[PDB]
Amino acid sequence: KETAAAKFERQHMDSSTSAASSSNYCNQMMKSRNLTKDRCKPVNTFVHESLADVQAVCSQKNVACKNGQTNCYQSYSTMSITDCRETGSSKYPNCAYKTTQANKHIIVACEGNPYVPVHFDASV
Ligand SMILES: Nc1ncnc2c1ncn2[C@@H]1O[C@H](COP(=O)(O)O)[C@@H](O)[C@H]1O
């Protein structure tokens, strides 16, 4: 089965690009990462940093999660990320997104042994 850890990597990791590939990036990536499979996933963030760097966030600044759990962590450094947001004109199965690149601190929830990212909570 797909572990939660693998699912985080599929949904949120993109170390290959340093930053968003112009205007087409979200359209292609949301599809290729299977987030347009059974609906247009409305909102999603990709992180353009090494896996090791993202994993290391599980030992950085402990902050409250949006759902009220205590297992969330904020990166001490800013990271290169891309926010994808579904357009008003987007209609399944033709899912359309705005690609917005930025540099922000990420917030991830971590679980397990090893203690790794399983949920992307926020960027700040
Ligand atoms: N603190 C957390 N630790 C682990 N997974 C979480 C956490 N917060 C949210 N999730 C995951 O993200 C989804 C969205 O959370 P919610 O909006 O509370 O339904 C949940 O179904 C979980 O799959």
Curated annotation (Swiss-Prot):
Disulfide bonds join 26-84, 40-95, 58-110, 65-72. Coiled coil: none annotated. It is an enzyme of class 4 (lyase). It is found in: Secreted. Substrate binds at residues 7, 10, 41-45, 66, 85. The active site is at 12 (proton acceptor), 119 (proton donor). GO terms for molecular function: lyase activity; nucleic acid binding; ribonuclease A activity; RNA nuclease activity. Its EC number is 4.6.1.18. Keywords: Disulfide bond, Endonuclease, Glycation, Glycoprotein, Hydrolase, Lyase, Nuclease, Secreted, Signal. One of its GO terms (biological process) is defense response to Gram-positive bacterium. GO terms for cellular component: extracellular region. Its main location: secreted. Glycans are attached at residues 1, 7, 34, 37, 41. The keyword Lyase applies. Pancreas. It catalyses: an [RNA] containing cytidine + H2O = an [RNA]-3'-cytidine-3'-phosphate + a 5'-hydroxy-ribonucleotide-3'-[RNA]; an [RNA] containing uridine + H2O = an [RNA]-3'-uridine-3'-phosphate + a 5'-hydroxy-ribonucleotide-3'-[RNA]. Endonuclease that catalyzes the cleavage of RNA on the 3' side of pyrimidine nucleotides. Acts on single-stranded and double-stranded RNA. Belongs to the pancreatic ribonuclease family. Interacts with and forms tight 1:1 complexes with RNH1. Dimerization of two such complexes may occur. Interaction with RNH1 inhibits this protein. Monomer. This is Ribonuclease pancreatic.
